[PDB]
């Protein structure tokens, strides 16, 4: 009746931005990335990769409501390194990690099948 | 009513094992031995075959309205 359609948890409707950046005025060099139609899959992994960075003074994420589909990621950084730059670098690091993992998993599959 | 297709918890295919389960029980298998022979190790899957009540066999006693 009021049940939402199953597709509107990963699909952007018309005129909805995938990701939106807003500076946090409370603290210098702090930004909030609101990503729509995402869940803990990207939130936790991006938070963990950001924490690995040494120049990131704070990295956290939250889903505001489970029935809604948004993740708000707060990233605060040292004054010489922007949060947007840290976010992009974290995603590139994750992409490189998963590409390397794909290569090594393929090699392991070939070895186990040959063996 | 009829055997479910998937295991509710883990999603393993169970609908293709009810007739085999009954056939093993006709072969004088303990129910644990039958489930082990069918390869259901997680107790979530075992619960479904162990507790299923097959009412469709009873519903087929009534003639169809065609």
């Amino acid at each position: 009746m009021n049940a939402p359609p199953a597709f509107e948890s990963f699909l952007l409707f018309e005129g909805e931005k995938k990701i939106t950046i807003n500076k946090d005025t409370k603290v210098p060099n702090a930004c909030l990335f609101t990503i729509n139609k995402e869940d803990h899959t990207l939130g936790n992994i991006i938070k963990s990769q950001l924490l690995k960075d040494p120049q990131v003074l704070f990295a956290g994420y939250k889903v505001p409501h489970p029935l809604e589909h948004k993740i708000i990621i707060r990233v605060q950084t040292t004054p010489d390194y922007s949060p947007q730059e840290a976010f992009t670098n974290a995603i590139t690091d994750l992409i490189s990690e998963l590409s390397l993992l794909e290569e090594r998993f393929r090699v392991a599959i070939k070895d186990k099948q040959e063996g | 009513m009829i055997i479910p297709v998937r295991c509710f918890t883990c999603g393993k295919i169970v609908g293709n094992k009810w007739e085999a389960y009954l056939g093993l029980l006709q072969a004088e298998y303990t129910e644990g031995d039958a489930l082990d022979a069918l390869g259901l190790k997680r107790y979530c899957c075992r619960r479904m075959l162990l507790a299923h009540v097959d009412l469709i066999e009873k519903l087929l006693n009534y003639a169809p309205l065609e």
Partner: protein, 254 residues
């Protein structure tokens, strides 16, 4: 400030499950990989059941729901298939769906079993994986089930019929060295299959400098995909999600 160098070791590889170990990785990446195994690997499952005639004892929605849960062989076709919502057609052309046809009439007095064997595909690469076969419905003398249905590409986040895994076992720190769990009586707890302690210990000695690593996986496939295909498609899909997010972020920053 950069990625780990994760290392894979496959312990077991059958036609129904794959067991492997990932070392040199944070917990979040491993958990998201397991999450993507469950909910983000696309497969082909039946949707859009059109029933022409159903005189069985089970009502129409029951039969359609059972048909949706039948796994279909989608090993190599699903990657080149498209989501129907994105395709440019009447929502059913060969580039975004696979037609199925069921037409069973029970004439003999004996109980007729409508199994997955009776589902005829129009594409040979996509068949029910059991082709014992999955029972759909039992029919009486004079009863008939006749329908046609398609099979679209979807993933487990939308509906559980598209979930390819029959249970993804995931573990780390089998000896509880990190003390992420605190046993009130550690002696009472059985050793995990990956445990390396003797039969006089209950937990490894506490490690303050420890970090989660060496994550043990066991991905059991329902059948629609080979387990190695599940893992490869999972990593590809997660990489694709992150690359698309980077694209949108670059557009937003620009």
């Amino acid at each position: 400030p950069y990625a780990n160098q994760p290392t894979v070791r496959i312990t077991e590889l059958t036609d129904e499950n794959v067991k492997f170990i990932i070392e040199n990785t944070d917990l979040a990446v491993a958990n998201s990989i397991r999450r993507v195994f469950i909910a983000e690997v696309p497969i082909i499952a039946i949707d859009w059941v059109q029933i022409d005639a159903n005189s069985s004892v089970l009502h129409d929605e029951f039969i359609a729901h059972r048909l949706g849960l039948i796994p279909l062989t989608s090993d190599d076709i699903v990657d080149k298939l498209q989501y129907s919502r994105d395709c440019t057609c009447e929502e059913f052309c060969p580039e975004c769906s696979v037609e199925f046809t069921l037409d069973v009439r029970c004439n003999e007095d004996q109980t007729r079993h409508v199994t997955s064997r009776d589902l005829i595909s129009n594409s040979p690469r996509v068949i029910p994986v059991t082709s014992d076969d999955i029972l759909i419905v039992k029919l009486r003398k004079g009863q008939e089930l006749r329908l046609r249905a398609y099979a679209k590409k979807g993933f487990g986040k939308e509906h559980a019929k598209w979930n390819p895994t029959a249970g993804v076992a995931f573990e780390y720190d089998p000896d509880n060295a990190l003390r992420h769990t605190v046993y009130p009586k550690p002696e009472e707890w059985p050793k995990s299959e990956y445990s390396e302690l003797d039969e006089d210990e209950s937990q490894a000695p506490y490690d303050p400098n420890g970090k989660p690593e060496r994550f043990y996986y066991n991905v059991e496939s329902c059948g629609s995909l080979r387990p190695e295909t599940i893992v490869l498609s999972a990593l590809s899909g997660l990489k694709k999600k992150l690359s698309d997010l980077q694209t949108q972020l670059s557009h937003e920053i620009q």
